[PDB]
């Protein structure tokens, strides 16, 4: 049960055990899923070029495809439209340097990792 | 003359008067018809059998002709009119064609009359469904069912009335070629189907058979009791 073993070793922060678990498995797909888990956890491994499917495994562990996957999700979840801080403030329902700085922070937070903004 | 459209289309697309007539049928006594090999059997649940009631007069199985007889379920008075009209037309067809009517012909006339009463001004639909059994001129047994709407179908075995659904479910399971090998087995199947709904037993079963080249024969209560005894005996050996 390689994926849960890798999770358990990550709970142990035993880098040697992470490497041993990753290179012990012979299944390429299981190694890809484990690479996804490692990339999410922020743990990276320097695989050997002799290891089969080194390229895609390294790309998965480096989260280089994270941006494209996130954008594909957002396109599927039809939320690609940028949001102005006014749509969050909703001042039309309410019966400065600091204000502008706060609004820039809101614009950054709301549209984080989307790549598009109206502002 | 009263000219009012009693039967009109509901906005849903239904003829509500026809459905109410079918409900009146569903409030009637269970009548079961089984088409065997050389016999056709009609068994009607007698509802409640009062000891002061002249059982001859209250009969839900009536012979339309020498080769055709039907058992109804629904409003008795409407059924009497339908039976009388069918008998008159049977005699007219015998006069014209010089041949006894086929089961299809009398069934079609009854259904057409019912449909006419579901589409005529001032007339409510007949509140009876009929099970018409008989033999054609070639000796083929035939069983047909007509409903207040005016649609008729041929059935190997069928049931109408309050217990129609359960009896039809039972007949779908026990109507086989083996079960209709002999006349006795066919009558036993009819009695079993009636016993699925009849509570007391053979006392509330009026059974009448018709054999090829023979007239309708009403089974006496002792015969039905003997058949029920046979079924009860056969029940034990299957346990």
């Amino acid at each position: 049960r390689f994926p849960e073993a890798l999770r358990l070793a990550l709970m142990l922060n035993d880098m040697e055990l992470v490497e041993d678990i990753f290179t012990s498995c012979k299944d390429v797909v299981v190694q890809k899923q484990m690479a996804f888990m490692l990339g999410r956890h922020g743990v990276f491994l320097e695989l050997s070029e002799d290891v089969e499917e080194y390229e895609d495994l390294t790309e998965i562990m480096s989260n280089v495809q994270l941006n494209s996957n996130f954008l594909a999700l957002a396109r599927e979840l039809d939320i690609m439209e940028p949001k102005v801080p006014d749509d969050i403030y909703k001042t039309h329902l309410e019966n400065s340097a600091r204000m502008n700085l706060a609004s820039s922070f809101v614009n950054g937070f709301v549209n984080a990792a989307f790549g598009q903004d109206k502002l | 003359s009263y000219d009012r459209a009693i039967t009109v289309f509901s906005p849903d697309g239904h003829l509500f008067q026809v459905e109410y007539a079918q409900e009146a049928v569903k409030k009637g006594s269970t009548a079961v018809g089984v088409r065997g090999r050389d016999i056709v059997v009609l068994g009607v649940e007698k509802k409640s059998v009062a000891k002061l009631q002249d059982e001859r007069t209250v009969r839900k199985i009536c012979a339309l002709d020498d080769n055709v007889c039907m058992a109804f379920a629904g409003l008795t008075a409407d059924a009497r009119i339908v039976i009388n009209r069918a008998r008159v037309e049977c005699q007219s067809h015998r006069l014209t064609v010089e041949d006894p009517v086929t089961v299809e012909y009398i069934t079609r006339y009854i259904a057409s009359l019912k449909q006419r009463y579901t589409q005529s001004n001032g007339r409510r639909p007949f509140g009876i469904s009929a099970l018409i059994v008989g033999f054609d001129f070639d000796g083929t047994p035939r069983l047909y069912q007509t409903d207040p709407s005016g649609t008729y179908h041929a059935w190997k075995a069928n049931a109408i009335g309050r217990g129609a659904k359960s009896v039809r479910e039972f007949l779908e399971k026990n109507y086989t070629d083996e079960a209709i090998e002999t006349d006795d087995l066919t009558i036993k199947l009819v009695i079993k189907a009636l016993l699925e709904v009849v509570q007391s037993g053979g006392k509330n079963i009026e059974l009448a058979v018709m054999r090829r080249d023979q007239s309708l024969k009403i089974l006496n209560p002792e015969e039905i009791e003997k058949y029920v005894a046979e079924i009860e005996k056969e029940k034990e050996e299957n346990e």
Partner: protein
Amino acid sequence: STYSRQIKQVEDDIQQLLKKINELTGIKESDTGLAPPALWDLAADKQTLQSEQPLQVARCTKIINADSEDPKYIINVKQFAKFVVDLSDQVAPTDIEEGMRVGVDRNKYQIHIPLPPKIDPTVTMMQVEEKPDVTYSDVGGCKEQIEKLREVVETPLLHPERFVNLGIEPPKGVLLFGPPGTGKTLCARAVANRTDACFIRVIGSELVQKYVGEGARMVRELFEMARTKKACLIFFDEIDAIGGARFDDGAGGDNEVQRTMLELINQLDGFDPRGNIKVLMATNRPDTLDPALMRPGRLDRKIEFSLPDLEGRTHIFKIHARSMSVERDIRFELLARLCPNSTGAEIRSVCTEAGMFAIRARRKIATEKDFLEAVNKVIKSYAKFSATPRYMTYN
């Protein structure tokens, strides 16, 4: 079982510890409305009790000599009395107007603070504070109806800039009508869930009151408190309770309800502008509504929630059977074909009864046969009690 003795020992220790903690901290009373002691600012409470004097609520009646430097204000202190007072030094003269509620002191009754207008608590509770759990994704077969409803009740509030630029005045009223179970209140709940402005739900039966003129008073106060917001939505569910057409039957047949309906009509489109209120009414008997209520400017859009077609019924079946543990080959198109004129409620009941048939047989997955039996039980067997055939004559 080996740990049971230690389990009970530590559990009793925990209970004793919790009681001991509650001994020092608080958590008691709760019948006299006492907050937990962690929120007790007792010094500030004493300072408020001393410095902050109580103020009796009165109503200003007339301002004498408003032009000069000595304006006298006639106030009507509720059931107490009537006085001629002057404003306190901390209130601007232009902040008090005739007919508005004020708050005055108990010694000289000088006006100390202008107050919001009085609103009936029953009217106040009519505004929605918890949005429903229904989105527009839960309404199937009503694409055009939902679009027409949204472009009146949601789009002008969300993006008003698209309307002011072209000199466009969007409709300010929508009447959802259709047979029962077709989704009028479902769409209203979806609107209330998606809306950001103040949403007020009014049931017509709530506008029926014991006394004469009280229903009109509730309508007036409802539109008064709806006008205290920049944008507002009022939902009138079952408007046929009070929206019936005016008639004269010799006696006083429905005179008071007709007066309530007339007050609602006057608020919708009368001498005074309505405001930014966008009303919304749902009824299964639109034929009974008054012609003046069914008029543009009061009910500008009339969205019909007719029974779903084949595609709409299939969409509703997909919506309600989404979380079902159905089989792999459920022919939902066939099921939609098997119930020609059926409301969405009947489709939901068909899904629920198919699940119930599967549960009764102790099965964790509902087959297509279960859905067929559900259609037979709901669409066919229950068709005697169907509200559809009678109610499409009314719509």
